[PDB]
Design an enzyme around this catalytic site. Sequence first.
Site, mmCIF file in Angstrom:
data_model
loop_
_atom_site.group_PDB
_atom_site.id
_atom_site.type_symbol
_atom_site.label_atom_id
_atom_site.label_comp_id
_atom_site.label_asym_id
_atom_site.label_seq_id
_atom_site.Cartn_x
_atom_site.Cartn_y
_atom_site.Cartn_z
ATOM 1 N N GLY A 1 -24.102 -8.312 37.690
ATOM 2 C CA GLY A 1 -25.381 -7.870 37.153
ATOM 3 C C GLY A 1 -26.132 -8.940 36.356
ATOM 4 O O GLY A 1 -27.339 -8.811 36.146
ATOM 5 N N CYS B 1 -26.779 -12.135 37.156
ATOM 6 C CA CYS B 1 -27.534 -13.140 37.887
ATOM 7 C C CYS B 1 -29.027 -13.049 37.601
ATOM 8 O O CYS B 1 -29.598 -11.988 37.410
ATOM 9 C CB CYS B 1 -27.194 -13.155 39.367
ATOM 10 S SG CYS B 1 -25.537 -13.832 39.611
ATOM 11 N N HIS C 1 -30.004 -14.582 46.473
ATOM 12 C CA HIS C 1 -28.909 -13.768 46.982
ATOM 13 C C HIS C 1 -29.138 -12.275 46.711
ATOM 14 O O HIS C 1 -28.395 -11.459 47.241
ATOM 15 C CB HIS C 1 -27.544 -14.248 46.494
ATOM 16 C CG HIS C 1 -27.167 -13.921 45.093
ATOM 17 N ND1 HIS C 1 -27.167 -14.833 44.063
ATOM 18 C CD2 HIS C 1 -26.672 -12.789 44.586
ATOM 19 C CE1 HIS C 1 -26.696 -14.239 42.966
ATOM 20 N NE2 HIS C 1 -26.417 -12.986 43.273
#
Lengths: 306, 306
Positions: free
Chosen positions: A143, A145, A41
């Site tokens: 932030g 991920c 993503h």
Amino acid sequence: SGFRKMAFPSGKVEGCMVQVTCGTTTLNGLWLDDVVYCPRHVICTSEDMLNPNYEDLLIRKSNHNFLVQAGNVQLRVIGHSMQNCVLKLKVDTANPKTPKYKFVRIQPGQTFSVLACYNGSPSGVYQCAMRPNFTIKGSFLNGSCGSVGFNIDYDCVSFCYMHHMELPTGVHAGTDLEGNFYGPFVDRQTAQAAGTDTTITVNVLAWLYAAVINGDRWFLNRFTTTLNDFNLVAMKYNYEPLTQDHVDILGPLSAQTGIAVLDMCASLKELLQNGMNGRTILGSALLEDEFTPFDVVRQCSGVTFQ
Amino acid sequence: SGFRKMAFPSGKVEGCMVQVTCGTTTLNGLWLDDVVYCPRHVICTSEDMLNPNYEDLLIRKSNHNFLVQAGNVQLRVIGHSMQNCVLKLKVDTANPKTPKYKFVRIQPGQTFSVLACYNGSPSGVYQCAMRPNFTIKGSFLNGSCGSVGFNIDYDCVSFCYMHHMELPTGVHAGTDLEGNFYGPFVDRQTAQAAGTDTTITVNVLAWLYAAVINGDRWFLNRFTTTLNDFNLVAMKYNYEPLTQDHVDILGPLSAQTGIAVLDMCASLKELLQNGMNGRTILGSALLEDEFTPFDVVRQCSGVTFQ
Ligand SMILES: *[C@H](O)[C@H](C[C@@H]1CCNC1=O)NC(=O)[C@H](CC(C)C)NC(=O)c1cc2ccccc2[nH]1
Ligand SMILES: *[C@H](O)[C@H](C[C@@H]1CCNC1=O)NC(=O)[C@H](CC(C)C)NC(=O)c1cc2ccccc2[nH]1
């Protein structure tokens, strides 16, 4: 003595965290050998995130679109692929700090350490369990991920988790390092349900054993029970059913303490039926289910790694 | 979202742990520059530990008596001294992994990360608070002495704790890195009392703020209070008195949430007077006092280090 939620030392993993930027989105990647792994993503715009066609989005991307930074250094992307929900960026430089590692998919009820990171820098470490409903109860902000979960076996790091998502209920979802989600979740910006969060019965029993080993025995009663009768209580309280393999697992702890598993099941039954009367066990006013039998043994017998 | 007890990443400290053996006693030392620091009780026999004269015991020792091992490597001891309850061994080799560091003595109510070690190998990491009574609630077995507690500020490791002792009550005592005990304790094998374990009021308030930030607000009530009236409740429940400096500390959190400190004091008063009615706050059925205001801010705004 004493019993605490303990993470693995995080040094072997710290050296593997990098930052990955595509457009405006920045997150963390894991740099092993000449591959960086991160949530796919990263390629999404805020708009794309609603109903992304990742194959189409990835098509519009080239190697040079991906800024991979390891400290103040830029790595050169010479290849990219998508594997399930993870992006693999081929880089020109093997990580000189690559530890001995493997990728594992853990089972529900097992624990791991999370190294929570922002901008490719480690922020902190804590222990989590993979719940029966394939979520974890973490601490993650925007932030985070690409932060990873891991166990240490000897000198070998077993990576088992990469962070992707927070559910409405405030719990967290992600993938193994091959990019397959734990649980039913998808990487799109929609509110998604994990379903009933059942309690890891075998873990609670491990923790009761830990309590006994540590001298807290007040909850031990005069009664015993049977599996089927116990489980008839478990079901009512959304406890995972106890199997005989679970009994085998607890065998060493039963043996070390002199307390039969079914006796401990009986004590647990009373706690479920009566609560704790405003008393505590190992400093908690709740039954704790995020320690495995292994976690209990290792902490009560001071196992190490390096 | 979510709120967890989080330790600092432990990589900078892992590289500083060594093993120290004198006679049959083995424990951990901290290797910074050309000095190894360890508990002086390493020189004790089981007999000596009852009523040790450390000066006399240290006299009978020479440099070559101390086996300092860093992995499979032996360091050469070229000097030894005693500083309060810590031994300093001068070695011939600066630690090439020495991080930027300082020694600090922390105040009661502050937190730090423990890197629990055996045989000079890191075993695990967890967060602790220095209680008002100068103990910590750790997880330590025989072999753990010399394990250190630390904070990370930037790239600078502030060492604040070295482990020496377990009290009858099952809590833990130790020294700063200059070898002065936190609290009244002495390094002799006698049962010693820490005294009344008061609750860190300012920390509980920080945690309530954390709860609110994270969406748990059920305990917020319609009432406010005064410092003096609140404290008149605090004293009864063995809470540390709240000062105005404590109010200044909480200022940013009050400001971020829109909830007055004295309003939060009022809600806390009700919780102390009424309990929690079998409800939870941030997954706990107890008021948690081992997060500082700083810890709350950093975790709720994703601060990092490297
Ligand atoms: C990646 O850093 C980030 C991590 C979360 C931000 C807040 N806490 C987290 O753990 N992940 C996301 O922002 C993801 C991105 C999608 C495309 C995978 N989105 C969500 O976590 C998300 C979207 C959404 C919509 C409704 C309800 C919950 C919800 N969570
Ligand atoms: C050092 O590794 C060890 C750490 C403790 C062992 C069990 N858990 C621990 O944290 N420290 C000791 O063994 C010390 C040594 C003295 C000489 C400083 N002794 C104790 O902790 C000790 C002695 C004693 C006597 C009565 C009651 C409690 C008690 N604790």
